[PDB]
Design a protein around this ligand. Sequence first.
Ligand SMILES: N[C@@H](CCC(=O)N[C@@H](CSSC[C@H](NC(=O)CC[C@H](N)C(=O)O)C(=O)NCC(=O)O)C(=O)NCC(=O)O)C(=O)O
Ligand SMILES: N[C@@H](CCC(=O)N[C@@H](CSSC[C@H](NC(=O)CC[C@H](N)C(=O)O)C(=O)NCC(=O)O)C(=O)NCC(=O)O)C(=O)O
Lengths: 228, 228
Amino acid sequence: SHGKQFTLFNHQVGPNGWKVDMLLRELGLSFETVYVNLGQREHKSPSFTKYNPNGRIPALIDHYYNDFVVWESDAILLYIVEKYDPEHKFSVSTFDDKIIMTQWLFFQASGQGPYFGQAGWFLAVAPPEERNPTIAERYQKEILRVFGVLESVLSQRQWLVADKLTIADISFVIWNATAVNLLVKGYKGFDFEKDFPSVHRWHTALITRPAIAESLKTKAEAIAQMNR
Amino acid sequence: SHGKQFTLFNHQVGPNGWKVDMLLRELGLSFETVYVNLGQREHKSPSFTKYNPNGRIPALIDHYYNDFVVWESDAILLYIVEKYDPEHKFSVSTFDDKIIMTQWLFFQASGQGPYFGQAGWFLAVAPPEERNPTIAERYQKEILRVFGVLESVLSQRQWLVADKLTIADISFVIWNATAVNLLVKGYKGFDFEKDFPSVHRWHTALITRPAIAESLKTKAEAIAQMNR
Ligand SMILES: N[C@@H](CCC(=O)N[C@@H](CSSC[C@H](NC(=O)CC[C@H](N)C(=O)O)C(=O)NCC(=O)O)C(=O)NCC(=O)O)C(=O)O
Ligand SMILES: N[C@@H](CCC(=O)N[C@@H](CSSC[C@H](NC(=O)CC[C@H](N)C(=O)O)C(=O)NCC(=O)O)C(=O)NCC(=O)O)C(=O)O
């Protein structure tokens, strides 16, 4: 055996580390996965805050680059493509394209994750008796708004930037899957394909890619295994 | 007269465009400010969504670069320093430093703005009768948590990256000022300097810089002028 290139600190249920898992699989990069257990607050212990002072997953250690550490899922995506996507299979080369890819990543990080996450909190993930569908509705409406925004551009472009698949597209996949299957499933008649057909086209193209499909399957199995 | 380099679409009350205003003043760059009026939903009209399909401010037009447009406040900060900070007065040169500056920007964008904003919504900014201090408390606690995170690093470093002032630091200023003066002012005995002395040191150093002080003063005047 040989030590793998990366350690990815991930979680079975939480969406965010799976963006990085998807990219690592797409690029064929070697990595071990360590599930940080949020219930014993392992993520808030010195042993993990030494990697991320924010004490949230994911974080990535690059063992083949002097154990360099990066946290924030979308910064990790940028780190990986800058250093390990020299053919720009999932990224871009020109300044103009790079800054717009970054813009879309910031939109994902500030406008998708946090709001979709509040829906998740109030609907499904908060302790059962702290859940609250009324407050959740504010964030379900924000999910639909974000879907509307994505619809407005994807009806006229195949991919978010430079007419090619990049980490900008990949970064949205895990929370969109969570929204479609949980957060707005059954919400005011929500029907993904009918209501947001361009977003559905793009999302479907993403999740049917073998690396991304494999990532989603791995997540489902990891969740299942928690109760083994 | 001569057309200024940038149009910054801003708002008088909302914090986010002021990050960009601060950076433009720091660099001595020329810009006009257009306040988009959110009450007539001008930001959701074709005339503004043509600049930002997300329909939120800020957005920036670079008139001296073929009217190139960037939105997401923190992507705008990156755009400006990549193209117009060649001496790295507010940014960094090496890959290792750049990716960590980006990591901190992602932390600001996903972990400060959105959560501080939910506190703002439930406490102060939502329509008066939709406000809710109980739900707001969840986000006030998150503000203190983020302050704790910043405290844990700023007690041992002067600035977030590379031991020099960068847009990573600047990006946090406007929401921190909002939190200290509004969102957690009077919350469970909150005292910024006593409770988070390193964050207080760093924040104070930032807001006493003449460009940033001028930005804050300009914002206060613009707000005042709305009721003229
Ligand atoms: N911007 C960061 C967010 C990372 C993140 O949220 N990680 C979660 C696991 S994914 S699970 C999704 C996550 N929800 C939570 O973390 C729920 C608990 C939290 N403390 C709360 O009060 O909401 C969320 O809503 N995220 C918003 C987003 O993605 O921007 C975590 O470590 N939680 C441990 C903890 O917080 O103690 C990134 O992209 O890396
Ligand atoms: N990630 C973006 C956020 C930009 C943003 O929030 N812009 C606000 C003005 S600053 S005002 C701060 C803003 N609050 C709001 O925008 C309040 C109304 C909103 N629709 C809601 O329901 O909360 C907020 O909480 N932001 C979270 C963050 O900064 O990440 C806007 O245009 N609002 C018009 C609208 O939404 O219709 C950025 O950094 O550019």
